[PDB]
Design a protein around this ligand. Structure first.
Ligand SMILES: [Zn+2]
Lengths: 90, 152, 152, 152, 90, 110
């Protein structure tokens, strides 16, 4: 709750007054780096067709991955396009 | 003294009157939405100062569709931006529409819709966005938003 | 003292250079259009004050097509925003384009196209909107509009 | 003291983080792009003054698509607008996404994408655009641009 | 006419200095409630896939209905689409 | 070389001091009339569906044209479309494929 040289540890955020380092609620926000954000980066949420592969830690966003049967790719990270893997077609 | 405002959808971040009004915007201040000399109430920005206002909004229609059985599948994704002024009924300001692909092989749909225009508004006038197929909207904050700002 | 404008497609309110220049915009104050220190003249916005101008236009392509036999049906809907400065020919400022669905099962299409940007204009310059397939544009005052306002 | 900027793609005039980041925007002063109290560094607009900024960008996806064989032809054209503030990683501000027609009869595709919105930015913050399918982007200066302006 | 305490009756719109109340241009504009609009809202103009049940009057707005065989719906209010009636599908 | 009435001759543009006219850069930009433009207009670079029938010059943009077998007409100047192979049933190819027109059919007279 004290900024080591203006920054605050990962999982917290600076204050308006600039004094304390408040932490990011679980599965609602976070900071995976030493920051000075007046707010903690909101957490992503997976949607049907996506299976949560990893909790949104207070210092690591949630990781979502296509359901079984569908994959993503670097040019199509917006929707899960129907051997097959979670990042490649068969 | 700045009169502007940008409010996004709630629900969270993205992976790392006709229609149906949208009230689920975020009335607070965050790292992506603010309210300056204006305010949200029921999903309606409420005008404090009168003047010309550039008003925009983006609505993300996303869906992972399957050609259902006992129904047609053509979709009219439309976004309306009405205003309530000293007059009983809501009055449309703008509207933008899209139609889902007609192909029988359409596995899915991504249709972000953005629109905007200047309009004269007076104190206590209120504006809001309304949309068709609201169950198909993606309210991640970077995807769907609504805002307006004075000009002159 | 404000310098802005938004003029809409006349024709009525909704239910409750390349291409072809759109000249049917409104030129008078109304409940959905105005001109403050700018004026319309033959469908063109005439600049009075020099400066950076955010210019925008929305144009609604709405058609209830029928698959015609011995012909191609692919449509290119494009909106062009031109300017007329002290130089004989019209200079393109921006263009935004769409293509109708290629499904033989397409029954109709709705394609609102919006675009906007800032450009430095000098006094007396003139800007206008041009479009392909104008016989498909829906000029309802809410479907299609045109405006610009000073910035900086 | 005006604060604004419109910078367009370079490749020539037109006939008369997620996704790859676009870094080939004009910079210098010309007749279709300018920088005023802002500046460009590696395709990133850099903030000089803190305040509310309307930020927009149009990216034109244009391709003469051929229905491949040992591959899926469905394309997800998406445009992302990020910012670099005093934080290790890029922060998404807005995203707009369209999908190509699913019709095996599709011959080509034209999908111009525009999006704008107001965000608070601090001095030395950096905003940039990034898109998917960058090999489909048309970079003629009236087809794709990027800019922003102050507003409080 | 004139307004009663800042409002003009239906079929009219208030003047700019707020002193008078001017009429709605028949078949052109209207206004169905007391108001202080500067301009009678513009009548809706029916379209080629629609029919006029009723015309426009200075206080009532045109009434357009989807043609025989076609219909509209909350979610699809932009275009008439192919028991069936003008507001619901088979 | 010299501003004739605060106006410059084709191929050139004026300076911000309005004192000197300046030549457009060949294969880069141009201007096809007299003017007061602080910058010359950029050349069009032909895309992969086009052929440079004529190159950019200091007083004339480049003329790009659709490739053989493709056309661009009034309501489709953005992308070259393909010429129909044959005609709809019962017509007659009153015309053949060209850069600004598709083949042309009409019905059987005699
Ligand atoms: Zn389609």
């Amino acid at each position: 709750s004290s900024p080591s040289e203006g920054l605050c540890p990962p999982g917290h955020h600076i204050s308006e007054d600039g004094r304390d380092c408040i932490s990011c609620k679980y599965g609602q926000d976070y900071s995976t780096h030493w920051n000075d954000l007046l707010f903690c980066l909101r957490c992503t949420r997976c949607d049907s067709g996506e299976v949560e592969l990893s909790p949104c830690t207070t210092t690591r966003n949630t990781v979502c991955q296509c359901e079984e049967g569908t994959f993503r790719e670097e040019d199509s990270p917006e929707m899960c396009r129907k051997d097959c893997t979670p990042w490649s077609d068969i | 003294q700045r009169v502007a405002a940008h409010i996004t959808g709630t629900r969270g971040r993205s992976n790392t009157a006709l229609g149906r009004k949208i009230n689920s915007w975020e009335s607070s201040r965050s790292g992506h939405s603010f309210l300056s000399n204006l305010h949200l109430r029921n999903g309606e920005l409420v005008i404090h100062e009168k003047g010309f206002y550039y008003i925009y909004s983006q609505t993300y229609f996303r869906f992972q569709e399957e050609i259902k059985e006992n129904t047609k599948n053509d979709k009219q994704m439309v976004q309306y931006i009405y205003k309530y002024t000293s007059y009983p009924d809501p009055i449309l300001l703008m509207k933008s529409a899209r139609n889902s692909c007609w192909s029988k092989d359409a596995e899915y749909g991504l249709y972000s819709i953005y629109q905007g225009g200047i309009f004269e508004l007076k104190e206590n006038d209120r504006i809001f966005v309304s949309v068709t197929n609201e169950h198909l909207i993606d309210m991640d904050h970077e995807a769907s938003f609504f805002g307006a700002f004075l000009v002159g």
